[PDB]
Nucleic acid binder design. Structure first.
Ligand SMILES: [Mg+2]
Ligand SMILES: [Mg+2]
Ligand SMILES: [Zn+2]
Lengths: 62, 132, 337
RNA sequence: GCAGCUUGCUACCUCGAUGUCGGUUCUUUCCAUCCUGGCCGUGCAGCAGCGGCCAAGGGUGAGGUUGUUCGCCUAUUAAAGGAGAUCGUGAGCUGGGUUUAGACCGUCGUGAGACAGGUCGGUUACUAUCUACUAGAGGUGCCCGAGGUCUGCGGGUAAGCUGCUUUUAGUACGAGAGGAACCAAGCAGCGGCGCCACUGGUGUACCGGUUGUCUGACAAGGCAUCGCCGGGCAGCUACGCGCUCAGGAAUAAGAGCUGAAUGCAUCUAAGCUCGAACUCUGACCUAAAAAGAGACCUCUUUAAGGAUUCCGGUAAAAGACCGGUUUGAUAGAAACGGGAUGUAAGCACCAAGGCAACGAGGUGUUCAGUCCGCGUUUACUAACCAUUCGUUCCUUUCACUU
RNA sequence: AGGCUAAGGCGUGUCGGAGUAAUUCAGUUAAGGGAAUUCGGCAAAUUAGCUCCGUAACUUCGGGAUAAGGAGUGCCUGCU
């Protein structure tokens, strides 16, 4: 199985699950659940919510 | 027609207005009917990815406007699943003006199209640039 | 009147729709034997569902040679005991039980279902059956088996379930000899089914209690202006002026669920022995975790969790021998959240 | 000549009321066959037509005008058949039309008024007595007492129906143009039965942000539709997922064999062989209350066993059903695993500023705090204590017992 | 006005318990499509306060007009 990583929460996708959101330009995003998709469509940035992995990266040097 | 590996829900509904994404000269079309669909009582005809359906041009150049034509769906906002387990979705529906066989009248397609129509209709695959 | 035609609502091939008289599925037809002697059935308890990633190998299929995701139902199958032998006689009025011989050794917890038979005639009764078959009166032989749910943990009950199975052979003498050989022993699921073969499943479905016509037969609601006039989920008309009666084919309300149903051509994907290979983190919801040996079935199976599932070799299969599936990954994610 | 599905003719029933037209919902019947199955003829090369015969198992749809039936039109489709059931169906619905009282236009009348012409407006009553049907229970009948496992007199079914693409094959046929069929495979539409690993909806458990106000302020809460907004587990659910065959027997139209009346010939007069989506069988659901009221086995007749109490849910409108009961993990508590939300209060440092007081807010302690109608371990508390049927009741109408 | 609280008057707009079906009266939400429903957008949804910019055909010159169509809005510190 090929391993694809969630765009928002930075988590591996379990095979047989997950989603794929394709954008009008052509950019593709991987969503591991409905929480990540909902926060994505709402407008949150992964950098700002600190339960995501990127938010942890900015908060380590905080 | 030839079977598809994936499973496509029939999202768009007869009466829907789609934004055609080619350079033939039309912007908006109106799905009238779906080829190869019997139906039952009270059910509106519906169309999904890779379905040839007759439309009507609503916004476009004067010569193309008011013309009944054939077209297929290349994207849809309603999710569908790959053979190996995954769900794919788009932000907007799209369609391309073609012929009965599948040759698109436009020589240029804007935006991505689903790979399953690319396998069913090879011409749409070649005429496209980015496939997701 | 220009009428618009519509297929009938629901199926009348399952009527009357009443509660099953027992909690154990009963088989009406046994297949034709095409091999060496063996039992034709087995029993187990349903646990839950998962999915697996297996290299596709269905011949002529579109997705051949590539990975796919498949839903599978995990079924717990502790070994069963063959407790008796029953002989049937053929005449004008159909089969008639004419003899039974029980095993000498039995489980003490069988006293909860029936009082334990005492060890009286064993050799003499068996030779009696042999003489009956020798004088050409007996036509077929059936085996009586029961389950032992005390080893499991997710199933509260501790009382066995008794049912009759069938032996598969090409002669009555062979069936009698095999039944003598296997009488009063433990039979494992591997001795009945080979990996990759098809099976037929029977079970009592989930119960919904009393339900109305809309959810019981799938009739149409009231549409438009009629949707707020007093009757929305009631049926349109109960009949015509003549005949002056309500037909039994009109949709009405009553029991829904808890019937006996059969599914055809379900494939067996894996025969397991250790339960750690299927148990998700936190165990299955409302069940617990698997302790004994199990079996993976492609697709869905009738009935909810903790329900008894009976299995028999296929009765209307088409395809030839399939082969052993190649399981690559078995999902053990949490079923919860 | 047939039918009574159009309009007429009659006045036999109903005026101490049998609620009209069309549409909607749901069920069924007919064949005079629109498609699907099988055959025959052709002025049938192939493809496709034309005409007729058997066949009622399945299908027969979506829209624009119009109150419409009817009819016209549009794009699909294998085809988008026609009739009957109080012109099926108002103690089911609707109220567009017609059929009250108001008013306008045209034409009649001297006038009140009228139209068989048009237009606008205009109340839809009832708590089901009997029967029928759909499901659920309690008795009595058959029966040694009780339990279990079966058989199957019967009942039901459409459980599947129909297309597109590929191979056969650019082959047979045809001057060319054009262009099939037996078998084989996949996919799809509709129908049926089920399920909840994946996706979507809900989720008035739960977590967070925030407005107005009240409890003196912080903290914690109340009310405003859950106040509103964001996320969401379990469960339920479809827009999600799984399965959904033949083979055989006897036949219809029809095609043949044998064969005489009628030396020959003849498919028929006896007899025989093939032959349909029809019929039966085979799958599937139900079925000892099958009055011929069943078979077999086991346990035991002051017992086996059954009920009630008690702890529960794979079940549940009431009943019923399925489990456990110390010789025990049935339900709950505690801890842990797996999850939901999003980093708690106080404390410290900084903060645009301000002489100061104060300061929205940020960073650290802190993947924190709060919560879980899920699991594991664990007898920590509760499944204890009992009653009742398996004796006609008293009488010594008794085989008992003071 | 509507919402939240005083004083004052009440728990009497005079039947309770239990929590488990169908159906029914009144509400909350709903993927993709968006009148395809129906005699007919009936019913329900959309918009909504205030400030600023801008405002058509027609006109009895009074109007149309809140036409249409766009932007801003909280809290804290210091002020004019
Ligand atoms: Mg009536
Ligand atoms: Mg009450
Ligand atoms: Zn994620």
């Amino acid at each position: 199985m090929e391993q694809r990583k969630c765009y928002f929460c930075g988590k591996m996708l379990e095979p047989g699950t997950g989603k794929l959101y394709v954008k009008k330009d052509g950019s593709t995003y991987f969503m591991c659940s409905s929480k990540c998709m909902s926060n994505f469509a709402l407008g949150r940035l992964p950098r700002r919510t600190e339960w995501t992995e990127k938010g942890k990266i900015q908060l380590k040097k905080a | 027609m030839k079977g598809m590996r994936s499973n496509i829900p029939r999202a768009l509904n007869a009466g829907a207005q789609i934004a055609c994404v080619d350079n033939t000269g039309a912007k908006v079309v109106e799905i009238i009917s779906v080829k190869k669909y019997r139906g039952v009582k009270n059910r509106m005809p519906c169309a999904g990815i890779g379905d040839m359906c007759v439309v009507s041009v609503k916004k476009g150049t004067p010569e193309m406007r008011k013309q009944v034509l054939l077209a297929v769906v290349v994207r849809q906002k309603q999710e569908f699943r790959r053979p190996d387990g995954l769900h794919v979705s788009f932000e907007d529906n799209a369609m391309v003006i073609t012929d009965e066989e599948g040759i698109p009248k436009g020589t240029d397609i804007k935006g991505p199209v689903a790979r399953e129509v690319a396998e069913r209709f090879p011409k749409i695959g070649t005429t496209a640039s980015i496939i997701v | 009147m220009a009428s618009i035609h519509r297929p009938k609502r629901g199926s009348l091939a399952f009527s009357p729709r009443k509660r099953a008289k027992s909690h154990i599925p009963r088989f009406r037809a046994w297949p034709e034997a095409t091999g060496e002697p063996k039992l034709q059935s087995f029993a187990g308890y349903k646990v839950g569902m998962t999915h697996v990633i297996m290299v596709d190998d269905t011949k002529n299929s579109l997705t051949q040679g590539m990975e796919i995701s498949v839903p599978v139902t995990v079924i717990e199958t502790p070994a069963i005991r063959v407790a008796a032998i029953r002989a049937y006689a053929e005449d004008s009025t159909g089969e008639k039980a004419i003899a039974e011989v029980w095993a000498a050794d039995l489980d003490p917890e069988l006293k909860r279902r029936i009082p334990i038979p005492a060890a009286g005639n064993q050799a003499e009764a068996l030779e009696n059956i042999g003489k009956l078959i020798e004088e050409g009166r007996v036509s077929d032989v059936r085996a009586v088996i029961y389950t032992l749910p005390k080893s499991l943990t997710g199933v509260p009950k501790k009382v066995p379930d008794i049912m009759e199975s069938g032996i598969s052979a090409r002669d009555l003498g062979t069936k009698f000899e095999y039944s003598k050989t296997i009488l009063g022993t433990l039979v494992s699921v591997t001795d009945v089914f080979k990996n990759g073969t098809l099976v037929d499943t029977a079970a009592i479905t989930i119960g919904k209690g009393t339900q109305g016509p809309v959810k019981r037969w799938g009739i149409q609601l009231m549409k438009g202006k009629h949707s707020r006039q007093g009757s929305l989920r009631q049926v349109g008309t109960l009949g015509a002026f003549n005949p002056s009666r309500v037909s039994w084919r009109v949709p009405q309300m009553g029991q829904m669920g808890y019937h006996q149903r059969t599914e055809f051509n379900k494939r067996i994907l894996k025969i397991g022995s250790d339960g750690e290979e299927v148990t998700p983190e936190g165990g299955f919801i409302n069940y617990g975790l698997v302790r004994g040996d199990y079996i993976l079935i492609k697709g869905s199976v009738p009935g909810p969790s903790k329900r008894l599932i009976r299995l028999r070799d296929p009765i209307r299969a088409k395809k030839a021998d399939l082969g052993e599936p190649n399981i690559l990954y078995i999902s053990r994610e949490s079923k919860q959240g």
